Amino acid sequence: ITEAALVRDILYVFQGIDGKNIKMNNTENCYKVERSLRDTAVRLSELGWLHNKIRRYTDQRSLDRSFGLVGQSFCAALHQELREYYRLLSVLHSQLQSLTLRRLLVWTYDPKIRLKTLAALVDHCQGRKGGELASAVHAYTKTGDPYMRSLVQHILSLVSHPVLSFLYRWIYDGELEDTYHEFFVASDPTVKTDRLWHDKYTLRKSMIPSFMTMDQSRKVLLIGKSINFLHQVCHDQTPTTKTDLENAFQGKIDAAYFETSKYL
Amino acid sequence: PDDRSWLEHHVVHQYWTARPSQFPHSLHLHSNLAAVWDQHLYSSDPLYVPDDRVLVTETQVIRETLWLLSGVKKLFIFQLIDGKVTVRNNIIVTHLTHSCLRSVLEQIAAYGQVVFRLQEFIDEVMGPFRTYQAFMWALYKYFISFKEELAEIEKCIINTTITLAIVVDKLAPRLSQLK
Amino acid sequence: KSPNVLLQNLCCRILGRSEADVAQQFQYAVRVIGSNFAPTVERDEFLVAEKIKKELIRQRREADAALFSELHRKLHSQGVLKNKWSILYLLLSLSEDPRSYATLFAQALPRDAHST
Amino acid sequence: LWEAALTYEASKRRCWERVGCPP
Amino acid sequence: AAAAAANLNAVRETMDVLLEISRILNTGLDMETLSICVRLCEQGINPEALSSVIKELRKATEALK
Amino acid sequence: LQQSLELKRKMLRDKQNKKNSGQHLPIFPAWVYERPALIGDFTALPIGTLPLASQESAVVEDLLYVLVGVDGRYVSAQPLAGRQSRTFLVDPNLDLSIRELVHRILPVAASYSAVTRFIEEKSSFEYGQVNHALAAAMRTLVKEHLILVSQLEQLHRQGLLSLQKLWFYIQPAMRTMDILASLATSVDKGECLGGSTLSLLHDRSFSYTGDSQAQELCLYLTKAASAPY
Amino acid sequence: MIHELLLALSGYPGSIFTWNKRSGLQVSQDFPFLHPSETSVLNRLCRLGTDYIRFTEFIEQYTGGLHGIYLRAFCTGLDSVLQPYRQALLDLEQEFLGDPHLSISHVNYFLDQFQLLFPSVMVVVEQIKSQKIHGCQILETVYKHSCGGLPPVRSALEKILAVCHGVMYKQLSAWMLHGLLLDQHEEQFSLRVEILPSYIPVRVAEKILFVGESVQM
């Protein structure tokens, strides 16, 4: 059988799509050819074997509305990363009409490493939301590969935008809201009269972020508690009175802490 | 020769008369689509069904559609059978499989009936009530500026890339108004 | 086209000067073009494509390494050029960054196991 | 000469019944 | 006849592609200078030689200014 | 194959007992070790009855297959599936000339596989930030080897590469991949990690200075490994 | 072919893709001119344009069933969220004129971001039909989806939500200054408070009612 057929088929199985004489029978086995070319073909189709997993996981978790905002950011990130792989593939189709450079092994060599990582990241964030998910992308920033550290640091900047938007409502106003469990403070459903201060706000220690210590969470909890007591009881109202950012938390929480207590 | 050559070359005339039209093109399916679809149908053993769709090129369809959306009558494409303008199914371009064509010309014929009934109402005052007269005058006043817009678009065809899907979205802030 | 007039026209494009006002730069041009005018290393546009990709991975731009791929595709789709090696290698040599190890890089064929 | 002559404006008439090189 | 003028059209769009590859590598050529550079490379010449030529000729108009 | 499964868990217990200020250290999934096609190393008629000037083309295509890991049709990569050792068998029916010429080209296959094992086992997080930066700069020279073999593949395709040219062409890359294989052996045997494999590279940089081609190799590798430290 | 797709993604099914109101744009025909695996690509691509038809059917019937000026504000925003899906379909045919090598994969690539807009806004279009919303409580039901999880549907609904607040500044402008209400029918009596969204508190509503009643005297 000619080589030209299997080259078109292996060009289709990079997307995750069976060829004409390449078929997929068992999902835990790699793609099988229907002699030397058949032996060569398997190492390239390992990519499609993993691509099915990484597509299916970010398919399911993105349409799941119990998975929450944190992590649907991660799905949006993974979708943006699979996009650029299809950007490669759409050009690679047009480059035929030799292209078989060790049967495209030097072509697939650099995607093979940008796809092992997302396969690690989907399984280390499995069934986890909030700060448990944030630590699970921060864990792969402990690598010593600079290309890998630069790769994962972008996705962490994607996941940390919802939590930081939740932070800036909690410091400034004292308001707290969630219909899921992704924040580090857990409010009491009872809305107390003057027993508020001790019981209205409790610390959710399971969902403290991977850039915040326990010290940081408790210290900003005191500020949010005070600025909530200022509104729900004292009835005073004054407007414009309230990943790393390279030590900008420890200044903003510091200024807000002083202002609320001195005015109280 | 002398006069028939000046006709034959520079005037379009083949398709709105009874004559087999010859048209060169760049073959190979992406715009040879009608012929490839007929080859597949005949290879799948129809049996015969000798379909006769004469031919037209694409841009002439655009200008006849614009003249129908204007409100003037008597065009070759768009036959009508009771006063409602409908598709002529005797035509093929080089593509559109005769089914996409039959749908898109039906969609613009739906607006053609809208403009045709109102120009019929406008004609039945032009050959005494004095409020109906003011009402049809209001519709006439809308229609003259409307026909100016399509007529200036038609001049830009003689000179950009234009197709059917471009001019329908171009006439979108007016075809919404006509309804 | 005649080579000598082609070099002094280059001296007239980069220097803001007439073609009877420059003969000194074109004399330097004759010094370098003579004795390096025939190939001294074998031609391969494949290598210089993967060395422009080597420049673009040096700046960690995979999307522009794939833009160079569609550009290099259009170059083959038309095919009106004959020496594809020299102009891309020339463009590669004048590379700057818009924002060690070079003896560990690979080399092309020396034209000593082949006729010069 | 040919590439000084290259600098004339491109055509604005495109054919969709000709997908390969419609000037 | 007809193809001999559309062939040079097929030269122009490649000449436009190299106009992108020139500006993303920050080269001192413009579009007119690159046309002469393609006329140089079709006849066959080491581009290290031309590059050394321009690497001196560019430093001999700003060293006198 | 089997023995690599111990080391990661054994060091994971040490780094798990050390760290009580943070939990859940990252590791690769299981199939990353399971599949033999993530690495390069795993109708047919006897070559002996062929003429000689067809045998040369056949054997050079087979050897170019062997360089990148996959087997040739007439030389088999022997299954051991254990340590940095790997052996190869050519058939005994080939003419004695071409085999004596082939046998001196074969060790660059063995210093390609033994390097390849070190890129998979020694990139996990029980070997640390220093070994990750060491390994991430050793994969680069493997990629440059892939570049070299793709260009010689192109030359061979049009019938313009022979064994006598090929023998001359691969020798500097043979020396590079031999340096990489010897250092991989030395790190694997002593079970070294941390600053103990930055003392090793400080000595190894002085140790090999034969043409100052390899001295600059290990000079780049010690700059690469010392960046996380 | 590659313009035949561009009418399938628009409102022209043709003979190749047979539209049905239970599962539309179907192809199960055998092609000697297309590869066997090509069908698979089209099948995934079939999920996109199908939704563009269904949204379009929803815009035709509206503007004793549902009534309201609230439904005349959701729909207008659904036009604007489909506007770049018009523009990024006009761009393709411009690109296809010169280039003959642009296959289906570039269309799948370029319109990959509408496999995140469309499925997260289709639940919003199904939600108002499965449970009927016709009062002033449309702003809550849209406002919980603009928080979203993904950036495209997060902005796409905010474009819609601004005009739903804007129609609510025609009622709260005529009532408070000119003493005019029921110039447009809803869906002393001055009540609107039950259908008002719950993130709007009771204090501002009791202020609004008194200010409106004072103009009558």
Author numbering:
A (entry chain H): 245 to 278, 285 to 347, 361 to 505, 524 to 545
B (entry chain J): 210 to 336, 357 to 388, 391 to 410
C (entry chain a): 7 to 105, 113 to 129
D (entry chain L): 282 to 304
E (entry chain b): 11 to 75
F (entry chain G): 150 to 191, 201 to 387
G (entry chain I): 1 to 63, 79 to 202, 256 to 285
Which sentences did the original study use to describe this structure?
The gamma-tubulin ring complex (γ-TuRC) is the principal microtubule nucleation template in vertebrates. Microtubules are formed de novo in a process termed nucleation, which is spatially and temporally highly controlled by γ-tubulin complexes, composed of γ-tubulin1 and associated γ-tubulin-complex proteins (GCP). In most eukaryotes, microtubules are templated from a preassembled γ-tubulin ring complex (γ-TuRC) that determines the position and direction of microtubule growth. Here, we used cryo-EM to identify and characterize γ-TuRC assembly intermediates after recombinant expression of the complex, which allowed us to delineate a comprehensive stepwise assembly pathway from a stable 6-spoked core to the mature 14-spoked γ-TuRC, identifying successive stabilization and conformational locking of γ-TuSC units as central principles in the assembly process.
Extensive 3D classification revealed a core of six γ-tubulin-GCP spokes as the minimal stable and most abundant entity in this experiment. This 6-spoke assembly intermediate was resolved to 5.3 Å resolution, sufficient to unambiguously determine the identity and sequential arrangement of spokes based on secondary structure features of the GCP proteins. The cryo-EM density of the 6-spoke intermediate revealed that the first module of the lumenal bridge has already been formed by recruitment of the MZT1-GCP3 module to the GCP3(8) GRIP1 domain. Since only one copy of GCP3 is present in this intermediate, this clearly indicates that the MZT1-GCP3 module of GCP3(8) (rather than any other copy of GCP3) is involved in forming the lumenal bridge. Surprisingly, the outer surface of the GCP3(8) GRIP2 domain is associated with an additional MZT1-containing module. As the only MZT1-GCP3 module present in the 6-spoke intermediate was already stably recruited into the lumenal bridge, MZT1-GCP5 and MZT1-GCP6 were the only other candidates to represent this additional MZT1 module. Notably, GCP3(8) and the adjacent GCP4(9) subunit create a structurally unique binding site for this MZT1-GCP5 module, which likely explains the specific binding of MZT1-GCP5 to the outer surface of GCP3(8), while MZT1-GCP3(8) remains available to form the first module of the lumenal bridge. The overall stabilizing role of the GCP6 GRIP1-NTE is further supported by direct contacts of GCP6 with the GCP5(10) GRIP1-NTE and the GRIP1 domains of GCP4(9), GCP5(10), and GCP4(11), effectively bridging all GCP subunits of the intermediate. Taken together, we conclude that the GCP6 GRIP1-NTE plays a central role in the formation of the stable 6-spoke intermediate, providing a structure-based rationale for the effects of GCP6 truncations on γ-TuRC assembly previously observed in sucrose gradient sedimentation experiments.
